[PDB]
Design a protein around this ligand. Sequence first.
Ligand SMILES: COc1cnc(C(=O)Nc2ccc(F)c([C@]34CN(c5ncc(F)cn5)C[C@H]3CSC(N)=N4)c2)cn1
Length: 390
Amino acid sequence: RGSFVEMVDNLRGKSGQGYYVEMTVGSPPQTLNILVDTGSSNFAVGAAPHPFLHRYYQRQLSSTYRDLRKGVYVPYTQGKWEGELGTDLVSIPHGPNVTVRANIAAITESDKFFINGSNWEGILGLAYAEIARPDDSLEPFFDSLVKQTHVPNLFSLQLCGAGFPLNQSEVLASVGGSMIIGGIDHSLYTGSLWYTPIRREWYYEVIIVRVEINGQDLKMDCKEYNYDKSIVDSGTTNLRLPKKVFEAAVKSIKAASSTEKFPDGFWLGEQLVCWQAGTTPWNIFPVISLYLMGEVTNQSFRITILPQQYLRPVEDVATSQDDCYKFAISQSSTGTVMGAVIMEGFYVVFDRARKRIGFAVSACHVHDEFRTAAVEGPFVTLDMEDCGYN
Ligand SMILES: COc1cnc(C(=O)Nc2ccc(F)c([C@]34CN(c5ncc(F)cn5)C[C@H]3CSC(N)=N4)c2)cn1
């Protein structure tokens, strides 16, 4: 049974551009599309004209707006935003039937933040206060929602990748998945949910205990997999791996697929590869399994993704009927990031109340008739806390 019909299919967008939910801010309500980001903790919206914004938050038009008289500056690797802190009334039209007074960063300047044609105007940081800017005293949206309402302290995400390119028109008209606020919808997954502990409440931090490529153990010291952390992050496209893990994984993926040779630019994520329509050789590419620490002592489980997850469909540079893709596994110097590449395979339950993350095979994951994504267990694994980096 699906018990959250109101919230099923409330997401739009794709990998590379981002999955967003409709929200309203202010009185009278101002509608905005908001990127869902489990990898940050600020609620921040465009609040001034920008070339890539079709609309923005107008604080002067909101009778319920409150100025906190405080600036916020958020530099990150590939860009930045800055703005002014305030509070206002916020609702999610395809969400729980509640209105909350939440912190809002009104973005007045940004660099490489807004994406042309993504159709979103702001970001919903769903992680914990520890990583909020300017500091942990700025209560994140979800904490406000839970404190002010009877909504259970849990949300779940089904991100639905298309498996083929969507153009401007198609992304608008299409369903990109579900964010179920306050519950778990049984219609969004098949098989069992398996839970991994949230190691610490800042990012959604987890512990990977083993990595396999087509069943072959990558055979690295498990600390390497979590150096300097492993996180579940809907605001990142790629599966991102620590440098040494990336090198080892790519060598193994190349060996598994060695019946075809791909240029270095492909493996670096820089260059697309194209096949004649319908002929993508999925079967030459390996499955990838991540083993996660279980809830029971000395137990683990595994999640397994297909090339249909880690090869990202792209529109051809020279318009044709070819099926074209980029490699969406990449190097990290900030630990493992389980981005949309992982998340598109799975229904992911962010069980904040019980400090755990649940995984189940997504009812919308892309596959062929020969192989599917999997969530399987249990496995007997030892010394797993040792896999955590300090
Ligand atoms: C499913 O495919 C996807 C998913 N997401 C996107 C996308 O455009 N994400 C996005 C855009 C801007 C942005 F700033 C971010 C951030 C906000 N960050 C942040 N915010 C506050 C802070 F204190 C520290 N870092 C870091 C930064 C890069 S990684 C992340 N998780 N979130 C994500 C595209 N395709």
